[PDB]
Design a protein around this ligand. Structure first.
Ligand SMILES: [Zn+2]
Lengths: 290, 136, 151, 286, 68, 32
């Protein structure tokens, strides 16, 4: 039997946030934990939930898995409807990409001895930005099989070669001592609507009128700001008439652009005043004494 | 196609020496079946038997299945033709070949399984391996 | 047993298969047995079986047999891997609600199961909502699950 | 009070939903209760993690209920080892509304946190409001003479995220969230939501007054006291002083919009000039 | 087809061939789309006579590629 | 060929509506 590149690691919405929260809190320590879930078939590894391991002490590296902590948490999670086996482990790489070092390879061999399809997921909480999390799932290449002249896994599809390996990972042993498993995310309608509540302002704020003394003062200041910008904007028009096309951008570097700031001031004021007017007009009928 | 089989085996060989991976290996086998589809000519597979043996797991499934593409329209004898290529029973890694033979057989009788349906229906019924059920 | 799927009765934990509302004279131990002894209930014909497996196991079909006197089941609700109080069975979502017909409940009838929903079954509970002849109590036979281990 | 605002992080909401979906499986569909973990910053709570606790109650009797408090201590120590700065700040339950027995449960939780904050986290996706309702237990001293009783006082709740928490949330909401809408469109959508929220709350008060009118619920005399204050605060927009000031203010903002629109047209014509110069220059050389 | 009918095996073969993205063995379905380009002469006996059709164009405009 | 030109133009017009609908839709998602 040979592993397939079509294999996918499915991380739930809950499991993704816990690794990011634990990984960011533990910066720069390679804070590790266990990934609970279920090996659905030979091509799916589901990560329903994860739980973080304590740090035994100081040191930016992956510590050994504490069997008592693992046994006690697994035993207690079964009491709250979490009877899912450990399908691997996760650890954080705070800013230097997602790969496995020498210590991580030994840590993964411990899991592969118990479960042959265990997955080592690496999360980069520092390099992860909004809408794009730097995550990767790795499983070791047996040196005996690859040295003899066999590919670590068979290729029966395109699914395993859609993501181009990074140079940082290829430097640190990717496709030599471990291989990457494509990661998909299990998101349901309920969990998506729940997260949409983030930064959702209260209904009071929509009808709340900004302080009129400060609104006039802000209108006062910004209109005065455009007074100088308009004076500078006239100079920019004459200057750019007699400017070589190589200086259309170089000469704009380090010097403030009157046109650009004029648009920002116009955009801010027109959003500010229209909302203040519209909200005020709405409140005159909604909150009416008659 | 048999009589007018003006295939160019120099093109296939020039890419056989450029095969270094399993993906490039299975590509040539699918390529081989394409240039010889309906020509009933497995000359490339006959003269490169030790090279074809490098295929493992589903590449064996694809390689055995390539026979049906080559022998498409060979209604005259296909059960004996496939059994000639494939022994009845084999222990090591024969599920991919046995399953591939069944799906090669359907490739021979594509849209024309007048009487091979009963054979494929029996083998799928008396099938234990998941791979053989896949080819069947 | 159907070809390719074994009788899973030896696989289950006999010590660990509990029953709810079971008359003492005929109990769960006599239920799993192939012989004539049954599993009758005391409080009502309504009865709740709980079956915990030793290893992960798939259930392809079941033989939940009962005597044709009318005490055999006519409504079986199957629940998989619950984290069951005779009120949940009244209002819940069974994995595959099954109306065990007279052919299904005799000594030879087997009941097909939705093999899709029965794949990872570490513990299964079968509930008898109603019997065939509207009697006070029910009776069972060698209730065995036919399938294969997850492995 | 002791709590000014409760900030509930998206991890808790996902954890609470997962708690409900794994206990409220084929077993049942009751409310599930867990334990809230977070820190304290000035007077705003920072609920940031939670773990489930075994819990059950009787559908009929409210005084019969069980909470595995030993399980509470064992997992708290489990969580304290990973993150010591995250202490118990209260409990949660997914019940769509409060229950009669929460005041008893809070007393059990009050041992582990004296200022325990109960946050009701509705798993159902309510359309207009936040899923979180944060309550704290207070001793209501009635003036009618009725003896002082323990009650829940509402605390304003907000959903905020950590930097890495918000990174993952934006990843999960990458496709669903539409960020193309400008600020001005968003603010008007806030006003529509504000109108919808007010109408719903006005409907709730009207529904309560309907029950009181028909005798379904008793006359409270604290809600009615508050209701007179609400109707008294209703401003008179027909006053001459107010209308003139409103016109005085509206015209003050209009001239600023007019000036900004006037500048916008000039800048837009400057862009059109550059485009036509670029287009003419490109075709001259080609 | 030559008449204009939607050739069912050709349509089916191409789509399942495009599923080689998910399953490489599915690439053999393109054999269904391979329609031979021929003119078959027959008699009243449904046999093939020695008939030599004439192509009124240059031999090189439609011919097999020159082997390497 | 007079009917064919009229019908060919009708399909070409209808295709233009399809193309102009998808371009506006793509512009909305390209901004996203
Ligand atoms: Zn590492």
């Amino acid at each position: 039997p040979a592993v397939d590149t079509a294999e996918q690691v499915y991380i739930s919405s809950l499991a993704l946030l816990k690794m990011l929260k634990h990984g960011r809190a533990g910066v720069p320590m390679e804070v590790m934990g266990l990934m609970l879930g279920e090996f659905v078939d030979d091509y799916t590894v589901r990560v329903i939930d994860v739980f973080a391991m304590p740090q035994s002490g100081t040191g930016v590296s992956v510590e050994a898995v504490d069997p008592v902590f693992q046994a006690k948490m697994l035993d207690m999670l079964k009491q709250t409807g979490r009877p899912e086996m450990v399908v691997g482990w996760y650890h954080s790489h705070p800013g230097f990409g997602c790969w496995l070092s020498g210590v991580d390879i030994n840590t993964q061999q411990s899991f592969e001895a118990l479960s042959e399809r265990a997955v080592a997921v690496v999360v980069d909480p520092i390099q992860s930005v909004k809408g794009k999390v730097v995550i990767d799932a790795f499983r070791l290449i047996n040196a005996n099989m690859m040295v003899l002249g066999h590919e670590p896994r068979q290729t029966t599809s395109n699914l395993g070669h859609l993501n181009k390996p990074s140079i940082q990972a290829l430097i640190h042993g990717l496709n030599r001592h471990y291989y990457s498993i494509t990661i998909n995310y299990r998101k349901n309608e309920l969990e998506q609507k729940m997260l949409l509540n983030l930064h959702k302002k209260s209904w009071m704020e929509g009808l709340t009128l900004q302080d009129y003394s400060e609104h006039c003062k802000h209108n006062e200041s910004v209109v005065k700001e455009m007074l100088e910008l308009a004076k500078n904007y006239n100079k920019a028009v004459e200057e750019e008439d007699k400017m070589t096309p190589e200086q259309l951008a170089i000469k704009n570097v380090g010097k403030q652009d009157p046109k650009r700031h004029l648009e920002e001031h116009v955009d801010v004021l027109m959003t500010s005043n229209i909302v203040q007017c519209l909200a005020a007009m709405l409140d005159t009928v909604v909150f009416k004494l008659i | 196609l048999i009589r007018n089989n003006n295939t160019d085996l120099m093109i296939l060989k020039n890419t056989k020496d450029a095969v270094r991976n399993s993906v490039c290996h299975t590509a040539t086998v699918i390529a081989n079946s394409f240039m010889h589809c309906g020509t009933t000519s497995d000359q490339f597979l006959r003269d490169n038997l030790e090279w074809l043996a490098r295929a493992t797991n589903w590449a064996k499934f694809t390689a055995t299945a390539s026979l049906g593409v080559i022998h498409k329209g060979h209604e005259k004898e296909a059960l004996q033709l496939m059994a000639t290529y494939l022994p009845k029973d084999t222990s090591p890694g024969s599920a991919y070949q046995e399953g591939g033979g069944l799906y090669a057989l359907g490739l021979i009788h594509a849209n024309h399984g007048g009487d091979i349906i009963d054979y494929l229906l029996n083998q799928l019924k008396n099938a234990s391996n998941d791979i053989v059920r896949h080819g069947g | 047993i159907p070809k390719g799927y074994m009788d899973l009765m030896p696989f289950i934990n006999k010590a660990g298969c509990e029953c709810l509302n079971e008359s003492d004279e005929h109990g769960f131990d006599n239920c799993l047995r192939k012989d004539t002894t049954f599993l009758e209930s005391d409080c009502d014909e309504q009865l709740l079986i709980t079956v915990a497996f030793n290893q992960p196991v798939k259930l392809y079909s079941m033989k939940f047999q009962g005597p044709d006197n009318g005490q055999g089941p006519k409504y079986v609700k199957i629940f998989i891997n619950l984290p069951m109080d005779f009120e949940e069975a009244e209002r819940s979502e069974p994995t595959q609600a099954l109306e065990l017909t007279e052919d299904d409940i005799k000594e030879d009838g087997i009941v097909p199961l939705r093999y899709v929903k029965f794949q990872n079954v570490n513990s299964v509970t079968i509930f008898v909502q109603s019997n065939q002849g509207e009697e006070e109590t029910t009776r069972i036979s060698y209730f065995t699950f036919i399938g294969t281990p997850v492995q | 009070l002791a709590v000014q605002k409760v900030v509930v992080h998206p991890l808790v909401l996902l954890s609470v939903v997962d708690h409900f979906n794994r206990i409220g499986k084929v077993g049942n569909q009751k409310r599930v209760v867990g334990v809230l973990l977070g820190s304290w910053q000035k007077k705003v709570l920072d609920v940031s993690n939670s773990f489930a606790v075994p819990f059950d109650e009787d559908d009929k009797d409210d005084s019969v209920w069980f909470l595995d408090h030993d399980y509470l201590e064992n997992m708290y120590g489990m969580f304290k080892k990973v993150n010591a700065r995250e202490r118990i700040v209260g409990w949660y339950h997914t019940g769509p509304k409060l229950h009669k027995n929460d005041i008893a449960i809070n007393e059990l939780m009050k041992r582990y946190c004296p200022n325990s904050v109960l946050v009701i986290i509705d798993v159902k996706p309510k359309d207009l409001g936040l899923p979180t309702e944060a309550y704290i237990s207070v001793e209501e001293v009635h003036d009618d003479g009725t003896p002082t009783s323990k009650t829940f006082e509402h605390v304003t709740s907000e959903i905020g995220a950590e930097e890495a928490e918000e990174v993952g949330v934006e990843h999960l909401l990458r496709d669903i969230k539409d960020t193309t809408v400008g600020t001005l469109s968003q603010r008007i959508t806030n006003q529509v939501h504000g109108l919808k929220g007010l109408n719903s709350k006005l409907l709730d008060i009207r529904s309560y007054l309907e029950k009181v009118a028909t005798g379904k619920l008793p006359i409270n005399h604290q809600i009615i006291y508050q209701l007179q204050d609400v109707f008294n605060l209703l401003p008179d927009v027909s006053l001459q002083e107010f209308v003139k000031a409103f016109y005085l203010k509206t015209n003050d903002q209009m001239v600023v919009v007019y000036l900004a629109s006037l500048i916008r047209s000039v800048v837009a014509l400057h862009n059109l000039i550059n485009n036509k110069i670029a287009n003419r220059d490109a075709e001259k050389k080609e | 087809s030559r008449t204009g009918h939607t050739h069912m095996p050709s349509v089916v073969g191409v789509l399942v061939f495009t599923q080689f993205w998910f399953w490489f063995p599915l690439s053999h379905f393109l054999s269904l789309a391979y329609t031979p380009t021929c003119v078959i002469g027959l008699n009243k006996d449904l046999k093939m006579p020695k008939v030599q059709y004439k192509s009124n164009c240059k031999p090189s405009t439609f011919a097999y590629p020159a082997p390497l | 060929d007079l009917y064919s030109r009229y019908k060919k133009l009708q399909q070409e017009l209808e295709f233009l509506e399809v193309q102009e609908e998808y371009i506006k839709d793509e512009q909305k998602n390209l901004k996203k």
